[PDB]
Amino acid sequence: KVFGRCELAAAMKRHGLDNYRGYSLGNWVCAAKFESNFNTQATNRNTDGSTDYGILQINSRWWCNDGRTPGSRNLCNIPCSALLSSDITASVNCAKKIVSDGNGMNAWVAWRNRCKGTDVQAWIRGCRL
Numbered sequence: 503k504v505f506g507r508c509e510l511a512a513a514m515k516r517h518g519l520d521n522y523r524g525y526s527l528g529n530w531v532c533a534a535k536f537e538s539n540f541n542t543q544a545t546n547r548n549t550d551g552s553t554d555y556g557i558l559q560i561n562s563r564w565w566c567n568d569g570r571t572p573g574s575r576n577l578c579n580i581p582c583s584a585l586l587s588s589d590i591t592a593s594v595n596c597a598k599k600i601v602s603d604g605n606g607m608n609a610w611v612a613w614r615n616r617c618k619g620t621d622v623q624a625w626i627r628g629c630r631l
């Protein structure tokens with residue numbers, strides 16, 4: 503599924519991401535825009551052989567099992583394919599674990615380079631939340 507900006511904001515809000523670990527909603531929307539262009543089916547392969555999955559581009563080196571990333575962990579305890587669902591629950595629940603791991607949203611390189619230090623509230627302006 504390709505979400506609209508406000509539709510995604512609402513879904514993330516219902517799933518408890520608004521101010522989760524002090525990151526306001528616009529941060530999560532901004533990260534999703536630049537990671538996946540709001541497409542839940544996005545995948546991208548990394549040089550190390552790991553793959554990033556879903557709206558928030560969660561990596562198979564640490565967080566999910568795809569059966570093809572040798573020596574990897576599965577800290578969210580989920581198949582990576584679950585991250586591609588139109589239902590964002592699994593992505594959101596895993597993202598809460600990642601953002602809690604010490605580095606905050608800096609775990610998402612697109613957030614650090616494209617969102618951090620910008621007016622992120624612009625990403626939810628106009629939305630009915």
Ligand SMILES: [Cl-]
Pocket residue numbers: 567568569570571572573574
């Ligand atoms: Cl694997």
Ligand SMILES: [Cl-]
Pocket residue numbers: 611612615616
């Ligand atoms: Cl980037």
Ligand code: NA
Pocket residue numbers: 555556557558559560585593
């Ligand atoms: Na994801």
Ligand code: NA
Pocket residue numbers: 562563564565566567568571574575576
């Ligand atoms: Na893995």
